Design a protein around this nucleic acid. Structure first.
Lengths: 93, 46, 204
RNA sequence: AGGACCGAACCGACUAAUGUUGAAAAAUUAGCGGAUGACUUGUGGCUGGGGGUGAAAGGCCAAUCAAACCGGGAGAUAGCU
RNA sequence: GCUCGCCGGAAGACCAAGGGUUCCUGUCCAACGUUAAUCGGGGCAGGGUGAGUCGACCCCUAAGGCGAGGCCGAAAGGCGUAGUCGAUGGGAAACAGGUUAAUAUUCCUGUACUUGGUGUUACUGCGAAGGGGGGACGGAGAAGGCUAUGUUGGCCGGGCGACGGUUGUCCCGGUUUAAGCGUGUAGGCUGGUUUUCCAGGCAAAUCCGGAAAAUCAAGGCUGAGGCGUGAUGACGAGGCACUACGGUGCUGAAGCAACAAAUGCCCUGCUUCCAGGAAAAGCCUCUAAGCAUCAGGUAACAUCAAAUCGUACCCCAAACCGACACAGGUGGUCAGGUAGAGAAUACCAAGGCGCUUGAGAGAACUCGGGUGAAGGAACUAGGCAAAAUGGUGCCGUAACUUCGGGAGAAGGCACGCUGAUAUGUAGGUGAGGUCCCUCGCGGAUGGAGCUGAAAUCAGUCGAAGAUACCAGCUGGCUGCAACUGUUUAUUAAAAACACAGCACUGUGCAAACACGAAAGUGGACGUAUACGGUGUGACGCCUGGAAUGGCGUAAUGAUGGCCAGGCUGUCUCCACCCGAGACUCAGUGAAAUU
């Protein structure tokens, strides 16, 4: 399980949006950009031990990149896994 | 009416795939001329 | 039994079917069936009849899609159900029994050293312990006019006599109904589900 | 019971017209054929080029087939322009 | 934002394969959209796909490929075992309402189900690479019940009419409630309970089966639907207050009976026929060695776990396949009313659209059509095309024949609406009351109410009542071919090709033949009523120009032709009108050829 350094490389960056702002008040769910594999045990243990908050349920989805055309050559964006973390009752920042 | 190319990814990977070409002895000659010429995409990537 | 049909429409004008209404309707015994791919099921029929001395009672008669003859389900006295060849003179609830005695009636099996001269014998074994080969088609009969010597003589259905060793089993009685030749199929479409393709003429 | 009858979806295109730098390197319109059986279709596999397949026209084999395409012998041969 | 029109068994919606962000928002007009575009499937930047119950993955498996070993062969390779891949099959489980600019059975709330493990209590003969059960199957046809759905009535909320009448027998809206559990009814299957033995199931069994006895006849199993919980709920016509006028917060009445009825469930069922219609896994049962204070199985509670992958969007197409925003094709699901037998035909409901160029004049000419003085095939190779009939009931219906057919032969009369039998009839369905009992999802009378054909009489209006659309012309003679069928994708759909039956020869299994240095394989897991080749092609006269068939044949035919009734601008011989081009204008804008 821990392996504390494994849980430190799952969380990439917090994600800000108009959906996460409404989900924080209506559903009390924080949206976090996580790694490529990102199993449900690692996300719940990562928010459970790193953010020190009681995680109720975890959802995941894969964000497919787009094709950016800037010049002659084609381009692509990095894929990232959107994670939904819903807590028991308490909220945080 | 019907056109000569009806798409099927499973039939295209079973016949024209990377592993069916590797499993034949003469397919490595196709890959040998392919790596001799040096194309970017060999046949397909899933 | 064959029944001719009224010519309401052509092709279905002269269709005469070869069936027997005494047989059952529905599925046969499923554990004795296999895949039999190239769709027809394969019946498990004991051609050897190796269990001797144990009697058997016939329950019903079934139809075979593989062969042109009919089979029968027998019931041994210890709880075993297998299939044999159905003769012509079989009735419901008949006692058949194999063995060295094999009393003279259609539906028993004895080695060819004990066949009476003049009787009709089908299902003749040639190779020791293989059996089953001769007289599998409907309408066949083989009679024996000479048994003496080291080999028995058979008057086969093809028209020639052949000497077989006398240490092999043989089934009494004759085959069942011979109306299988009388089916003419009435139309071109009848031979389409039977696997045969139309023949391309050479001079065409 | 029915390769039975009429007639839908569906399949092939017989007639007539149009189309020939077209909507389309074969399609539309109006009659016409089948329409529960010799029907059609999806998906998957097999049969490969002096070969396969063919209800036999010498039809088809990727818009090409009286011997497919690619590469090689080959800058072949040509008595022709 | 208002009005008109189209599709509406689609031109609508969720989807499969495919596509790859084309999905949503802001901004921009170089190109891209056949015109402009301020808009967009174009660019710029941001966002958006939430799974134990959806699917994929996974277990096993048909066709088929690889196929460690192994047979054979110059190399290569042919073949193949034990195995393993291979969904187009089977195998765990969830519904309702609500929400955002875009996603939902995945997000909030309420309520269930399923797999494995841990802990506690209590009980216990547990245990497969073995056996049995079941998984596990063709085509066609009919009957009943119910649901979704539509209508009527009641009830609830809002109105009294922009022009005659409208407090009424009025008009508008609603009348939704799931999954699961319990009950086991319509319906189907099987005779049960107890006891003794067993050569079958490689040994075994209390299990499957068989063989002997006693009792009872209605018990056991599968199985749509109705009722209760689910639901002192949600949703709801219509309301009340604060407002970026977009919405937010809260409240919210009735929410039921009858009729009709699905291609949908009972039904992988029932009847009937022959062509006789996959295999395996999960699960239950039974034991072998062993374990039998252990372990495993069983009942309840609590806890843990159910991972990864796809989830935006078109999909009978502007996004896939045709180089395109192209008149082609592309799997199946949902299938409202009226008229009609119908998924055909005409209109409307929800929904999506008016097809990415238009505006003028109404000339010649081209195309799609409509009507038409008189004649009705005189036109043309050719009634090709066009025109004409087209539906139901009654009398009635010919030549021929294999007796099925021709036939709907042709030909004579009626078809609308309103009252009578009957203020709605035959038929179907069915409330309340009476009676009996295990006492129930139960049965016999009986008709309230609802729905509802078909025929007769009488009256009446229109030139025309099959009133529109859809919707066979009819009768005779004859060639070939029995018939339905097949083809020269893309100029010939025929007499050419195919045909069941029939005629001839050979083949006894280690079968003929074919395929192969050999191994191996088809025939065939067939057995002389079977197998391979040849010629002919229902059938009658028959085979002495007569089965490379002679002569005909009912029916059949995108097969060749003639006549007869009617019909028509096909023609005499062209006239007018409705449309799209052609003429002009705004913008874009080539080719063949030189």
């Amino acid at each position: 399980m821990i392996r504390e350094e494994r849980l430190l490389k799952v969380l990439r960056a917090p994600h800000v949006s108009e959906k996460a702002s409404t989900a924080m008040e209506k559903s009390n769910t924080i949206v976090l950009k996580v790694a490529k594999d990102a199993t449900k045990a690692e996300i719940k243990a990562a928010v459970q031990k790193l953010f020190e908050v009681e995680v109720e349920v975890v959802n995941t989805l894969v964000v497919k990149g787009k094709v950016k055309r800037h010049g002659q050559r084609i381009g692509r964006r990095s894929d990232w896994k959107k994670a939904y973390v819903t807590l028991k009752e308490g909220q945080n920042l | 009416m019907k056109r000569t190319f009806q798409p099927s990814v499973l039939k295209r990977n079973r016949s024209h795939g990377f592993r069916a070409r590797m499993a034949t002895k003469n397919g490595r000659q196709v890959l040998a001329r392919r790596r001799a010429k040096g194309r970017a995409r060999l046949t397909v990537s899933k | 039994a064959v029944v001719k049909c009224k010519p309401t429409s052509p092709g279905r004008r002269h269709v005469v079917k070869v069936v027997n209404p005494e047989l059952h309707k529905g599925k046969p015994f499923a554990p004795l069936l296999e895949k039999n791919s190239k769709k027809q099921a394969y019946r498990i029929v004991d051609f050897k009849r190796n269990k001797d001395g144990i009697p058997a009672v016939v329950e019903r008669l079934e139809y075979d899609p593989n062969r042109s003859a009919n089979i029968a389900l027998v019931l041994y006295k210890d709880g075993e159900r297998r299939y044999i060849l159905a003769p012509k003179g079989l009735k419901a609830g008949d006692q058949i029994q194999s063995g060295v005695d094999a009393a003279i009636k259609p539906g028993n099996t004895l080695p060819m050293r004990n066949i009476p001269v003049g009787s009709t014998v089908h299902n003749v074994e040639m190779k020791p312990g293989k059996g089953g080969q001769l007289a599998r088609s409907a309408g066949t009969y083989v009679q024996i006019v000479a048994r003496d010597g080291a080999y028995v003589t058979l008057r086969l259905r093809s028209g020639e006599m052949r000497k077989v060793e006398a240490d092999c089993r043989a089934t009494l009685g004759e085959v069942g109904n011979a109306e299988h030749m009388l089916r003419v199929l009435g139309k071109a479409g009848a031979a389409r589900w039977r696997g045969v393709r139309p023949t391309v003429r050479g001079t065409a």
